[PDB]
Amino acid sequence: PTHFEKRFLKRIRDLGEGHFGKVELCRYDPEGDNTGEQVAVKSLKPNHIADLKKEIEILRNLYHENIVKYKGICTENGIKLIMEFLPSGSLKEYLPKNKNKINLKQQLKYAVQICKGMDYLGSRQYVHRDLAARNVLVESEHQVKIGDFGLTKAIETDKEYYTVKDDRDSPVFWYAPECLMQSKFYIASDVWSFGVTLHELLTYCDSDSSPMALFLKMIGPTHGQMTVTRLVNTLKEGKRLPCPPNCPDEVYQLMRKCWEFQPSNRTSFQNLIEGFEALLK
Numbered sequence: 001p002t003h004f005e006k007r008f009l010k011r012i013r014d015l016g017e018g019h020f021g022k023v024e025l026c027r028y029d030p031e032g033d034n035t036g037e038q039v040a041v042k043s044l045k046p047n048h049i050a051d052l053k054k055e056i057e058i059l060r061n062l063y064h065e066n067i068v069k070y071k072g073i074c075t076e077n078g079i080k081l082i083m084e085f086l087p088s089g090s091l092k093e094y095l096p097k098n099k100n101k102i103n104l105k106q107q108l109k110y111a112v113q114i115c116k117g118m119d120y121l122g123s124r125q126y127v128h129r130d131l132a133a134r135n136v137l138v139e140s141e142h143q144v145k146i147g148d149f150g151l152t153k154a155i156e157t158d159k160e161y162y163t164v165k166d167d168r169d170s171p172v173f174w175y176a177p178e179c180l181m182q183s184k185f186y187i188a189s190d191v192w193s194f195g196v197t198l199h200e201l202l203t204y205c206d207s208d209s210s211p212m213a214l215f216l217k218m219i220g221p222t223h224g225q226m227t228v229t230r231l232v233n234t235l236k237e238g239k240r241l242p243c244p245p246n247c248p249d250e251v252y253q254l255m256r257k258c259w260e261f262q263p264s265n266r267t268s269f270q271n272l273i274e275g276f277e278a279l280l281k
């Protein structure tokens with residue numbers, strides 16, 4: 001049930017790619033008649049096998065309505081992670097195609113669902129470290145799920161954070177000051193990334209309004225080396241992503257509470273759930 005044979009995983013197309021990992025759409029077809037189920041397969045790009053094993057162990061341990069469902073594994077010396085496939089794809093793919101169909105009420109319900117999924121992940125003592133719209137999957141127009149855990153780490157025992165020893169290519173434009181200045185990741189650091197994801201969601205994932213595009217227009221291009229320093233300085237000055245068009249004051253105030261410079265001053269996911277639900281009538 002949880003073991004998928006590689007020869008029967010018929011490649012269809014790519015769903016997404018990282019630096020060292022890729023997610024592909026496959027049809028698991030053991031009958032050879034093309035009636036098999038479509039699944040999302042995460043593997044290693046052409047090791048790092050230990051990190052995919054950790055991700056598998058994390059996802060197998062998560063059971064929640066707003067978290068992509070683990071289905072099993074496929075072995076090669078190598079390993080692949082098998083997950084349910086959500087045909088509507090990420091919010092980055094879905095929102096620009098459905099701008100007219102999705103109103104503020106629906107966006108706020110997605111924000112509650114992501115916070116519920118994140119609060120559940122935090123209760124398991126994990127930090128996601130990669131919360132962005134590209135990682136939020138659309139199950140239906142009424143439901144979303146957190147769909148990738150490639151950077152997820154277990155919080156160091158009796159500590160409030162995880163210290164990254166690598167961070168090779170990480171989503172710096174979604175990162176809190178403590179991640180950028182000290183490589184320390186708190187549950188509060190995910191709260192900051194959430195505020196950035198909420199900003200993406202409210203702009204319908206418009207590429208011109210993306211966190212990278214906006215910050216590249218605020219700071220200016222330098223590439224690779226000085227980007228993080230110039231981002232830290234911009235954040236120290238009190239500059240934040242602006243209020244999206246048609247975002248009400250009440251929603252922006254919640255978003256701004258995700259963006260307090262100090263981790264201890266930020267709102268929690270439980271407070272965000274209650275705050276958004278109070279706006280839903």
Ligand SMILES: CCCS(=O)(=O)N[C@H]1C[C@@H](N(C)c2ncnc3[nH]ccc23)C1
Nearest residue numbers: 015016017018021023040084085086148
């Ligand atoms: C290492 C690559 C990270 S990434 O590319 O930034 N995001 C992931 C691609 C995936 N995604 C769009 C999916 N689309 C459809 N069904 C799905 N099930 C499970 C996943 C998934 C999330």
